[PDB]
Amino acid sequence: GANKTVVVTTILESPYVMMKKNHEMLEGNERYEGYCVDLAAEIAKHCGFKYKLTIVGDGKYGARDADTKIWNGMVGELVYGKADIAIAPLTITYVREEVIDFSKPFMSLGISIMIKKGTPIESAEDLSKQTEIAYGTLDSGSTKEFFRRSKIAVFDKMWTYMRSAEPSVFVRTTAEGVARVRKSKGKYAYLLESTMNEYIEQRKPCDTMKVGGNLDSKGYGIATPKGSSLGNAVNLAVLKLSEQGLLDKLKNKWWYDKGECGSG
Amino acid sequence: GANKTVVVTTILESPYVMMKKNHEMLEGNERYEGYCVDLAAEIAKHCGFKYKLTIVGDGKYGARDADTKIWNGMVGELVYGKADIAIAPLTITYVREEVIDFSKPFMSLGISIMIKKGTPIESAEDLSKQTEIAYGTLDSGSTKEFFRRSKIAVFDKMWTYMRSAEPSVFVRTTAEGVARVRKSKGKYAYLLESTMNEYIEQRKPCDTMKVGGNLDSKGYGIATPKGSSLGNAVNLAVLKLSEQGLLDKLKNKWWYDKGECGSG
Ligand SMILES: O=S1(=O)NCN(C2CC2)c2cc(Cl)sc21
Ligand SMILES: O=S1(=O)NCN(C2CC2)c2cc(Cl)sc21
Numbered sequence A, B: 001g002a003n004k005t006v007v008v009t010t011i012l013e014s015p016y017v018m019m020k021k022n023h024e025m026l027e028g029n030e031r032y033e034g035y036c037v038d039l040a041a042e043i044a045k046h047c048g049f050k051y052k053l054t055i056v057g058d059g060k061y062g063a064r065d066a067d068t069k070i071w072n073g074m075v076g077e078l079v080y081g082k083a084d085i086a087i088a089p090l091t092i093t094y095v096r097e098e099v100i101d102f103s104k105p106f107m108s109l110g111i112s113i114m115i116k117k118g119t120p121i122e123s124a125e126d127l128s129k130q131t132e133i134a135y136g137t138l139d140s141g142s143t144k145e146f147f148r149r150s151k152i153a154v155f156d157k158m159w160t161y162m163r164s165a166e167p168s169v170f171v172r173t174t175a176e177g178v179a180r181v182r183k184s185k186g187k188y189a190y191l192l193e194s195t196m197n198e199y200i201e202q203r204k205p206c207d208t209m210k211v212g213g214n215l216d217s218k219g220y221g222i223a224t225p226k227g228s229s230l231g232n233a234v235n236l237a238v239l240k241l242s243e244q245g246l247l248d249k250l251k252n253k254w255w256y257d258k259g260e261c262g263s264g
């Protein structure tokens, strides 16, 4: 039938989607800025739709409750028909691709380690062989599920520690994890995606660092409900923006051009 | 109908698919070894099909002739019904995704520069701003099409040079490009995918190296004819094997565990 405004679910996560400084005097999509705000505008332009950015109600990326089988987060908003598309740092995973569609990836990432500068940690293996430095991940996200489901030796060992550690090593938001690194005098390391790690590394007070290689290799995709008619066009739009260099331009714009820790 | 043997198109490109040293005494799929041979066996087992590996008849990856509009290479074998699936270092691109389906990527790559050691080149900009050192790409591939289509100034300048260079700077096979680097005393640099560059860097005589950053960021996907009933299972299998670490293991097996230029 007639064209309808597309409901976009997304998540407040720097530098993907942020409230503008003067957001309180702005309306609708103009309240927000960031990589995914720019990406949404480009996708909509190339696919020919109007859209409304909405922040995911529960603040979560998306995981399935093992007892009720109900999906939360942005994934749930797609599954249950509350949003038409998710444009966010939403990680492509097997279990999610069973219930929603993902475009080809628009950004690469892997799980990585954030330390406060000077922490004597260089790798996941180092973390797994000590207990002085606690370490954890974000809840309801792909990083936690990676460790939970993993049968890889070192990652299995880390999960056995994290799931039982008291007090909890898990956090509800990326910001909470970063703050915990910064205020723990080196006694907490945060496991998070390399994209977010590398962003924070270039933000004041310039006291965190990514260390070691990434633990895996995956990416973020634009997600739609299974079988949605938007999926085909959105997938091609991602590939076009990739081939034009726009994804590279936007990454530089939001990570490094704005960097606060020097011109390195 | 009854299950039928799946025809896999692939290409002789090291270390993805190679003839075994004793292949004349072997039959069928056993004649071949390499990363994509191993991957094909896993994809087939996880999706529950029998398969036959076949080497693409024309030795090409896939490009559309601008006049006849016929697709050649592995893409053509899928488009015209000669093969059911491609399991090969076949690059995801916009123009290909319009006519065939790609799985989520099973390996990352970007266009990169191969030099003979000691060549005074550190970047694509360096190449573009001089004339003593020639440079070119493979034929009928995604790297050539990237330069042909690029609107980025440095890459536009490089294409303007390469398309008019005489004698031709393009090569028919990767081996021809590498041999040209090795015999040109530093006066030829080869533009090829980082995966193949890194592999050759670890092969005797250890006289080439990858220099500079990559020029773009993309990946290889398993390709099927548009609308194939195999695509969904293959896509989920790639993601499962990615999460379980298979892809990282196979990359190390065929690139680095067998490297001939030291334990660097
Ligand atoms: O989760 S994936 O779709 N597949 C796994 N990989 C690795 C190259 C193998 C990947 C990289 C992206 Cl960038 S997105 C994805
Ligand atoms: O050609 S893609 O499907 N999309 C573009 N990218 C870049 C992360 C943006 C990518 C990486 C892969 Cl690995 S596969 C692909």
Ligand SMILES: N[C@@H](CCC(=O)O)C(=O)O
Pocket: A061, A062, A089, A090, A091, A092, A138, A140, A141, A142, A143, A144, A191, A192, A193
């Ligand atoms: N991008 C992740 C959230 C961050 C994390 O889990 O580290 C997801 O889609 O679940």
Ligand SMILES: N[C@@H](CCC(=O)O)C(=O)O
Pocket: B061, B062, B089, B090, B091, B138, B140, B141, B142, B143, B144, B191, B192, B193
């Ligand atoms: N992987 C490329 C071939 C190699 C290249 O173009 O550098 C393709 O699919 O066309």
Ligand SMILES: [Cl-]
Pocket: A093, A094, A095, A096, A141, A142, A145
């Ligand atoms: Cl997941």
Ligand SMILES: [Cl-]
Pocket: B093, B094, B095, B096, B141, B142, B145
């Ligand atoms: Cl192409």
Ligand SMILES: [Zn+2]
Pocket: A023, A024
């Ligand atoms: Zn406010």
Ligand SMILES: [Zn+2]
Pocket: A042, A045, A046
């Ligand atoms: Zn655009």
Ligand SMILES: [Zn+2]
Pocket: A065, A066, A067, A068
């Ligand atoms: Zn519950």
Ligand SMILES: [Zn+2]
Pocket: A156, A159, A160
């Ligand atoms: Zn376990």
Ligand SMILES: [Zn+2]
Pocket: B042, B045, B046
């Ligand atoms: Zn297997």
